[PDB]
Chain length 390, copies 4
Amino acid sequence: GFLPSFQHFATQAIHVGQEPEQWSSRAVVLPISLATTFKQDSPGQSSGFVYSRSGNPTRNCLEKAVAALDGAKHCLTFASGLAATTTITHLLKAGDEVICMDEVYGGTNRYFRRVASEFGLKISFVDCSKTKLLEAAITPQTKLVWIETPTNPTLKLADIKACAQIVHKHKDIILVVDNTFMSAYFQRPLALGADICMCSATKYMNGHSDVVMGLVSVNSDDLNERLRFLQNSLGAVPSPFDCYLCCRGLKTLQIRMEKHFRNGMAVARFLESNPRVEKVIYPGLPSHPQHELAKRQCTGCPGMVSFYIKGTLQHAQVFLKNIKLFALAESLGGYESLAELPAIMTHASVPEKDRATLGISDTLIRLSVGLEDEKDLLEDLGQALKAAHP
Amino acid sequence: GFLPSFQHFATQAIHVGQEPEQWSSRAVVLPISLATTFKQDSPGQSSGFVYSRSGNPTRNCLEKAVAALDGAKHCLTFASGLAATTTITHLLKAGDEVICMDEVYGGTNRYFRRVASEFGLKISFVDCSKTKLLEAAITPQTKLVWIETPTNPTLKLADIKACAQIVHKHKDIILVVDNTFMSAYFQRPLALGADICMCSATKYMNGHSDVVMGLVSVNSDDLNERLRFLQNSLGAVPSPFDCYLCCRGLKTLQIRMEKHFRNGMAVARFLESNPRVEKVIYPGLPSHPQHELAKRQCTGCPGMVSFYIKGTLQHAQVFLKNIKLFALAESLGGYESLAELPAIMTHASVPEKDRATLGISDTLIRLSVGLEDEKDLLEDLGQALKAAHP
Amino acid sequence: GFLPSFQHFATQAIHVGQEPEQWSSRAVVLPISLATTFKQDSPGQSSGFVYSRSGNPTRNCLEKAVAALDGAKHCLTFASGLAATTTITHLLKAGDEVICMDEVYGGTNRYFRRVASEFGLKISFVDCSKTKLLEAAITPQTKLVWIETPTNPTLKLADIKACAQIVHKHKDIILVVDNTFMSAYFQRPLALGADICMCSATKYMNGHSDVVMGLVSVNSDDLNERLRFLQNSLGAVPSPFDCYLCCRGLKTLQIRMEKHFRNGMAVARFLESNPRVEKVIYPGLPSHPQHELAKRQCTGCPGMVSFYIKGTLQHAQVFLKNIKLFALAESLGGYESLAELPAIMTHASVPEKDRATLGISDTLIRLSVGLEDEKDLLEDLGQALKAAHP
Amino acid sequence: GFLPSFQHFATQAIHVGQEPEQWSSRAVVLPISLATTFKQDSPGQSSGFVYSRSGNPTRNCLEKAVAALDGAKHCLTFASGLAATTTITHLLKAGDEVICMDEVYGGTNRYFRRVASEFGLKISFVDCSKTKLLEAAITPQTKLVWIETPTNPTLKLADIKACAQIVHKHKDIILVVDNTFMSAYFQRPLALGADICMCSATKYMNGHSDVVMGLVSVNSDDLNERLRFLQNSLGAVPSPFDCYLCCRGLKTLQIRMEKHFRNGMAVARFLESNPRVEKVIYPGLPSHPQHELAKRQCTGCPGMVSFYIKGTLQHAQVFLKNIKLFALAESLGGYESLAELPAIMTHASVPEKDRATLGISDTLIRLSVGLEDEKDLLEDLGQALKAAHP
Ligand SMILES: Cc1ncc(COP(=O)(O)O)c(/C=N/NC(=O)C(N)=O)c1O
Ligand SMILES: Cc1ncc(COP(=O)(O)O)c(/C=N/NC(=O)C(N)=O)c1O
Ligand SMILES: Cc1ncc(COP(=O)(O)O)c(/C=N/NC(=O)C(N)=O)c1O
Ligand SMILES: Cc1ncc(COP(=O)(O)O)c(/C=N/NC(=O)C(N)=O)c1O
């Protein structure tokens, strides 16, 4: 019952920006161009490449592919998801206000709360799953609304089209959607009214746990010009080698995301029927409080499954010590299954009282379900839960 | 007559941080670890690696080597020299003031003037080659003094020890020296009183025109803690692949820099006796106005030579069209000889009236003398100057 | 109606040999170790790494993963499929005889016919699709039988179990199956009686058209010892960087091969009903003469589809000029759709009279169907065939 | 008193084959093109790239640079020095004879003695430092003479011009010189009458202990055609990534080799005056028995120094356990100083009686002197020798 799949996604992921005719060799795969500089025909010629930080063949090719997958006219790549977040925030100026989704990646929270707030920006954290709370938080000084959906790590949704309608009633507010948890294959925020589609390509977009990278996609020529200026001027740019590996990852994005959905749904159903589990959170389950919204704004669901184990922190620790296929590690969106305890790991920097309000408790486990055989994943979770609750 | 050479530099560049015992394999060369994440023995363990952006084996190994070469306790790597500049600026807060050397890389000028200044920072450009002008510009709100020496692109010097003495009479002012043009082999700002030694590793430190990277070295544990927080929280981090290539470049840094000095001095002497050249600028020539200061604060001089061609922009254009070994291109500090026209290329973003005051005229040519045979370089410059002025 | 799928394949492709505990860092992804050499605790210690050609961490990790996917105890990697072929041939000696499948890759034919035959080896080409012809060609001097199934490029099959039974009635004959066209996911020659499973990892195993590599898998400890001696002594070894990229490719092998099968079957059915096509060859179609054998010895079929266009070479040339999604290029098994004319390209070195006997005519087109959207692939073939035959 | 230095070597190492005009981007540094295949304008077009094993942009660019440095018209790259040796041996046929220098790398000995000899080739090991022994070993069946000079590991020389005159009195004998120990910077066998200049680029040519590679340089169009056929048909080809790193290494070859000579000469003089050393071998010392020949056929000497420690294997082991800057490890020609015991390590495969005849005793230590500070290297050797002989 999800939105129908993007129909040319796999074709675009393989071909857009990848014409062999652009290379002297007619290579069918884009070259890795490491050169920092490029010979000019005359001083300050306005065409061709000039300096790697400003633009380079491998990065420019990746940006064309990602733009197509995000349904965007323009894409910019960065050294990390947090570097993308920093660059977007530099669109503003002293005196501006940001509204941020109350539950975000701990590093996003840390950046807004401890860094951006020291340079004349006012930050408010608001539960944007309730559109009336977003409506009430907007002031004439609001210039940016930052929403993750689903949220890291409790997988709360925001209605992107409903939030876009609220913010676009006001003059000059940018809506950013952090699309990291869904990927371009399952959610397209620019088609739902977002002004900026941002993600940590570190996760599903690259998909191989071997690249740290941020991606920012826009339709606005004004936002493109302002962001291009900052990509060049702050210089938080990715290695061309990383651009190559991320481009290589995109070639399998459609088939990886379909497998993450099959495995994720099987894990979520398994946990929901296991008596050692207090509560499962997966947007693809009917039990998710926003399951109907997920079907209205997504084409499917990835491999992110969160659950509350029965008991206390001690039981969560025993579960995470006994997993043998899932690895206790940070990150998500790789081919390999990962598990973490957000309260002690990714969200340790979020104040304890804020974690309590958000439901980031000492029994919340976040799973990133990989591409392994379903039966092997369910046997691993089963035996680890039995070790925690004999 | 320069300061005596650093005596263990080549040994440290090859061995510091490179112990084979730290690798399971006992590899004599550091591995490239691309992994974004690392398996933990228990949740939030305080030791080992956690997440690539926060720290990773290849980057941490490079940072240990660069720290030793800069005479520093601590080193941080960034996605670019401009990302290093952005990260250092985030040490401050709204209401603080920066004093910047009046002549800097065009991108540094653009960042301070057009970006940092919009986030509650006051920026003043001061000729820090005159220590009384630096003294007079300091206010109680000054928190950062940013000096390049020699300057890009007219190779003006600042007396680092004299500037350090002035800023350290006040409470809580950070002195940054951008050491890009000298390299760690020829100038050690932390030994002359700088608080931060910054460079674009894109240039001499890597030396192979195939890595964009920034390096920041400090002795202060307070500055290390604040900068480490921002490396992690802004996420302007380098690829581990780029860290490997930069580490590979450091292994030849001493012998490259000695050859840049031999070739640079030969080019400067050749241009100084050529009647088609109005004026040569090279800190190693007795004709440089600050030659005596260069000998007091450096162990030598690299391959950066600037000159004013006789005549007009038309003659500069004909010279740059006729060079056949030197390539018309941005960047510097590579094995390959490069030439540019800063007024139209690297410094085009600096307002025309500011270029005029700084001496960045339409006849100023910046050379980066590479590692080619001296006779081939002198014949190339000779025939190109003859094409401009028969 | 194919053999049932390998059930732990995806789990093994992700986990076998990839334990984080083997790395000092506990990296969840294998490091790229470029080091040529490794520090020894004492001279000629028998444990640990010694010299990259003899063995190295990245290559040894890939070999463990491939061995599991081939159902093998041992795997050896080489610089190319042809280097694997050369190394296997060096198992023999002057006076030995090789029987080779009559239709093989042009380069395999060239190696046996023009190179191996000059070093005291007698080569006979035999149609091993007819087991009585194999039986009749074996002499007391036969030491190696080399079979490709399906064959490059007309996709003829050999009954591996039936050929194994024939050769194993004799003393000391090695049966090699070149598994390049099926991949480890769809065919397991070691489980059907082959002594050696060889492939060009250049094709499906890597799957991203960015690595040239050969793989050889065995169960015999004797063959492992003899081949390991030759991997080290001929030195036709892969780069650790290439081993990393091939390992990265294996992580998606199961889901890529399932998509190649869906797309390949759709293309084959489309060509079979198109009146501009003389004849389609696809082992998954009931029309293939050996369709029933394919179902008895394989778990599916990949994306290799061959067809004879109606008319002459001129029509084949017009088809190959008008394809806009398929690219005219050598190779196969990549994510991108490729087309070639074997008589003029891959099999040009095979004598014209031998091409005629094998059915490698000037109207035979070989397609490698990639991972693009099925509808886009069928529209591209349709419009190109219409350009050839209005 | 050595031959005068090659005068354009550094210019050629940086520029030959590296024209920015050949790249669409005008990159000043060659791109890494990993593509296995290349789009053709029509089937079997005779120009452009076709298939990575047959030729590719990065490898072809490296081959142009190495050809210039070897004074050759043609260069071919291979997966290793041993793969280059295997490929050259495939120039022959059953019934041909090879004469090999009696002292060679252990792996070269193993290949000729245990592998090539099984394919109808007769191998004779001859002390080619005595030209009358070479003259007497030649028969009408001799087709190849293989000489290393200086030899691995006792640094015996052969007079290349005198050996060339002897073999070229006969019809159709190829003289190969393995130039690994000298590098192209110090010895040019093609200018002294060799038909083939071969080396392990694993050592000095790459110089960074991170690439395994073989290089073969020729002037003959006949040898080029025959070797090109075998590079393509045996497929023992290097990764384009390895070709890039080797090309990057060549940019510093001149300055690295000059430093290896300064450090190597200082180490040799230090060992020659140390009472814990029985005998030092270094071609640059007047004490070397062939010092006068070294000055007639080389432009200098690299960092390879061999010595016999006083006493027994126990003293050699204590020396190799106490070195703290030199590392006990195989290989040579890197920036890092290495030491090995050839009798137990590189030459363990050579029969014990052959080692005795050649002087490869249990007290022979081979040093590869790196690019560290001279004083640090002499202090390390001094303290390690004192640990062995208090
Ligand atoms: C929704 C979302 N947005 C941005 C980022 C930052 O991206 P980067 O790390 O590329 O700077 C992340 C990182 N999450 N990492 C984790 O949750 C973990 N480390 O496990 C995120 O989850
Ligand atoms: C003194 C100095 N500091 C910092 C940077 C920025 O470093 P990055 O480019 O790594 O962000 C540069 C760049 N110079 N580039 C040139 O002058 C050219 N592009 O020719 C610089 O010269
Ligand atoms: C069945 C089979 N076995 C071995 C090889 C050699 O492998 P390598 O090229 O890695 O040395 C190939 C190459 N085929 N390439 C093509 O058909 C093309 N070039 O289109 C093959 O098809
Ligand atoms: C003179 C000479 N020629 C060829 C090779 C083989 O090259 P490759 O290793 O690239 O196949 C070597 C290797 N020597 N390695 C050593 O001496 C060591 N392993 O210490 C050699 O020394």
